Design a protein around this ligand. Structure first.
Ligand code: NI
Length: 270
């Protein structure tokens, strides 16, 4: 019988779909429409784990809801694939958004394809071959996007983000995130925390803010008004329907947006 593979987040649906092709079923643990930051496990979803053979986990802080779901299920001892086993993690609390990096995605894809190959040896060769072809497309995505960068960002080019999602993404450009607006992962800032953030943006002369496309924040225009910073939006790859192509479609948009913020910070003759 065909493997039934549980996934927790949209990038993982894309990774597994691209690895298995038509040789296994990819099943989301939470229905399309839920914000995974806000999701609380339902009996309906807990029941579905009983029909699965394995669950692929981010397991580094972005799907603790999944481990609770499995604990409360008919199958508490279900095999689990820890996708981030070989991924260098930053760092205290680990930033769990490793899926928003092309290089960490490739590492994750390879770990998953290997682990799935052991559970289903009949399709192991297909899983390994598909992982290699998906990785090749991912490297090309990054290469084409980085080639459009005329210059590296200037020394004073400082970046802020609303959600703490993009440290792994910006590392691909050799950049760091100067400040994150949300005080903690998926936590909304209070008026005093937002004032503190604005003071920091001004004091450190932060040039750009990457806001959320997926579940936008209501306070973003105040930050832009009060600090004069340029606004660009990025995708956490957490909204809408699950699809095999979702990850590369949205990562291509994310890389192009980062390139555009860097080119737009570049001055000409004056
Ligand atoms: Ni997040």
């Amino acid at each position: 019988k065909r493997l039934r593979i549980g996934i927790t987040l949209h990038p993982y649906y894309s990774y597994v779909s691209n690895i298995v092709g038509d040789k296994a079923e990819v099943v989301p643990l939470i229905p399309a429409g839920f914000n995974p930051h806000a999701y609380e496990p339902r009996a309906e979803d807990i029941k579905r784990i009983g029909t699965l053979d394995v669950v692929v986990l981010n397991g580094v802080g972005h799907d603790d809801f999944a481990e609770r779901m499995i604990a409360s299920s008919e199958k508490p001892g279900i095999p689990v694939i820890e996708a981030n086993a070989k991924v260098p993690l930053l760092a205290k609390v680990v930033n769990p958004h490793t899926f928003l990096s092309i290089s960490a995605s490739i590492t994750q894809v390879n770990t998953i394809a290997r682990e799935l190959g052991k559970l289903d040896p009949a399709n192991a060769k297909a899983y390994t071959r598909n992982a290699r072809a998906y990785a090749k497309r991912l490297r090309a995505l990054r290469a084409d996007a980085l080639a459009r960068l005329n210059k590296a960002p200037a020394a004073d080019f400082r970046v802020a983000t609303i959600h703490g999602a993009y440290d792994y993404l910006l590392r691909e450009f050799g950049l760091e995130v100067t400040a994150v607006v949300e005080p903690a992962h998926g936590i909304e800032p209070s008026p005093s925390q937002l004032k503190k953030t604005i003071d920091q943006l001004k004091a450190l002369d932060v040039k750009v803010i990457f806001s959320e496309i997926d579940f936008p924040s209501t306070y973003v225009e105040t930050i832009q008004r009060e600090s004069g910073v340029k606004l660009y939006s990025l995708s956490h790859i957490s909204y809408g329907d699950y699809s095999a192509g979702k990850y590369e479609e949205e990562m291509a948009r994310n890389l192009d947006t980062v390139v555009r913020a860097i080119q737009e910070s570049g001055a000409e003759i004056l």
